[PDB]
């Protein structure tokens, strides 16, 4: 995972300038893309503990979805190792990415109500925040344009960041680590009716993010009346879905299931 990545075949757009860094989108268009198209879009956020990682992680998935007619992109965002930020800054960057795609939907050939947020682990957390967590800051961007994604596809996300409703000192410690009140960046704590649809892929033998946290999330989302499809991968570990692991079997399966989810919600045309 090189940073910055090459991302061969990607067009590069700076979606945000902040702390003297240009944050980029690596954009993959379908071969028949034309101006004035209104395609569904997907924005992928890499994983890495909000500390490290690279948009290269989701290059294969971007190529797949561009092949299916989406405008597919991988977003850079600030991380601890490179930028000395905390989780709340990462969340602001992810929201800025969705905002930017919506703002620029016309020139991207994109339907601004068919923008999917996606990511792995910490990036799956970010994608979830774009669907369901209120904005915590108003950066220098179009405030009239919503940051909220229209759907999410999450690969073993972190979804519970506060222990409330499940130690005042631990919540104080988390406040310092996250850059805000832990509940304010905890998707689980913002479960309500009327949220965008999503699909989640999670291994049952995940020792980083316990499967039980995701089962609790999905159960509560379903009780609130939301479409929240949880696909367990029996015995699979954290990062199982990545391109280049386990003969690409879980990679291919998550794409197949994600594709069908996007068909189900009317963001993709059926194959053939
Ligand atoms: Cl694991």
For residue 175, report the distance from its CA to the centre of ligand 1, in Å.
26
Q: Are strands 110-120 and 39-45 parallel, antiparallel or unpaired?
A: parallel
For residue 265, report the distance from its CA to the centre of ligand 1, in Å.
30
Question: So where are the chain's domains?
Answer: 1-272
Least Cα distance to 216 among 6, 224, 168 occurs for: 224
For residue 212, report the distance from its CA to the centre of ligand 1, in Å.
13
For residue 156, report the distance from its CA to the centre of ligand 1, in Å.
10
129/137 Cα distance (integer angstroms): 13
Q: Are strands 110-120 and 21-28 parallel, antiparallel or unpaired?
A: unpaired
Q: Which fold has domain 1-272?
A: Rossmann fold (3.40.50)
Which stretches does DSSP call E strand in the chain? 11-18, 21-28, 39-45, 71-75, 110-120, 151-155, 198-203, 228-233
182/161 Cα distance (integer angstroms): 6
* 198 Cα distance to chain centroid: 11
For residue 208, report the distance from its CA to the centre of ligand 1, in Å.
5
Tell me the CA end-to-end span of the chain in Å, nearest whole number.
34
Name, in order, each residue with C-beta under 8 angstroms of 63's C-beta and a sequence gap of 6 or more. Answer: 9, 28, 72
Least Cα distance to 88 among 44, 143, 129, 47 occurs for: 129
Name, in order, each residue with C-beta under 8 angstroms of 181's C-beta and a sequence gap of 6 or more. Answer: 175
For residue 240, report the distance from its CA to the centre of ligand 1, in Å.
9
For residue 143, report the distance from its CA to the centre of ligand 1, in Å.
39
Q: Is the peptide bond before 4 cis (omega within 30 degrees of 0)?
A: yes
Collapsing DSSP to helix, strand or coil, 115 comes out as strand
For residue 32, report the distance from its CA to the centre of ligand 1, in Å.
40
Least Cα distance to 136 among 94, 169, 106 occurs for: 94
Sheet holding 71-75, edge to edge: 11-18, 21-28, 71-75, 39-45, 110-120, 151-155, 198-203, 228-233
- Contact between 61 and 43 under an 8 Å Cβ cutoff? The reply is no
For residue 179, report the distance from its CA to the centre of ligand 1, in Å.
26
- Contact between 220 and 166 under an 8 Å Cβ cutoff? The reply is no
For residue 201, report the distance from its CA to the centre of ligand 1, in Å.
13
In this structure, is the dihedral angle defined by the CA atoms of residues 181, 184, 186 and 192, taken in order, positive or negative?
positive
Residue 151's DSSP bridge partners are 116
Q: In the 8-state DSSP scheme, what is residue 199?
A: E
For residue 229, report the distance from its CA to the centre of ligand 1, in Å.
21
For residue 235, report the distance from its CA to the centre of ligand 1, in Å.
10
180/89 Cα distance (integer angstroms): 10
Least Cα distance to 58 among 68, 71, 70, 72 occurs for: 72
Least Cα distance to 97 among 70, 67, 135 occurs for: 135
Least Cα distance to 228 among 153, 127, 130, 155 occurs for: 153
Number of helices (H), then strands (E), in the chain = 8, 8
For residue 237, report the distance from its CA to the centre of ligand 1, in Å.
4
For residue 125, report the distance from its CA to the centre of ligand 1, in Å.
17
- Contact between 28 and 73 under an 8 Å Cβ cutoff? The reply is yes
């Amino acid at each position: 995972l090189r940073y910055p990545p090459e991302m061969p075949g990607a067009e590069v757009k700076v979606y945000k300038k902040v702390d003297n860094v240009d944050l980029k989108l690596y954009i993959y268009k379908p071969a028949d893309w034309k101006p004035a198209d209104r395609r569904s879009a997907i924005v992928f956020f890499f994983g890495g503990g909000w500390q490290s990682g690279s948009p290269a992680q989701f290059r294969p998935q971007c190529e797949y979805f561009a092949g299916r007619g989406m405008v597919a992109m991988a977003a850079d965002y600030r991380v601890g190792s490179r930028h000395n930020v905390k989780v709340a800054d990462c969340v602001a960057d992810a929201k800025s990415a969705i905002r930017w795609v919506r703002q620029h939907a016309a020139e991207l050939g994109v339907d601004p109500q068919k923008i999917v947020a996606s990511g792995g682990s910490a990036g799956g957390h970010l994608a979830a925040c774009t669907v369901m967590v209120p904005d915590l800051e108003a950066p220098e961007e179009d405030h009239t344009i919503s940051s909220q994604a229209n759907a999410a596809i999450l690969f073993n996300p972190v979804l519970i960041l506060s222990r409330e409703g499940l130690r005042q000192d631990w919540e104080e410690r988390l406040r310092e680590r996250l850059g805000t009140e832990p509940k304010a960046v905890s998707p689980y704590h913002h479960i309500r009716a009327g949220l965008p649809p999503m699909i989640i892929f999670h291994g049952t033998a995940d020792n980083t993010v316990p499967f039980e946290t995701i089962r609790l999330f999905a159960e509560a989302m379903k009780k609130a009346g939301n479409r929240c499809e949880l696909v367990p991968f029996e015995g699979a570990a954290h990062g199982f879905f990545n391109f280049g692991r386990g003969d690409n079997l879980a990679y291919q399966k998550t794409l197949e299931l994600a594709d069908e989810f996007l068909v189900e919600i009317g963001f993709l045309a059926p194959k053939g």
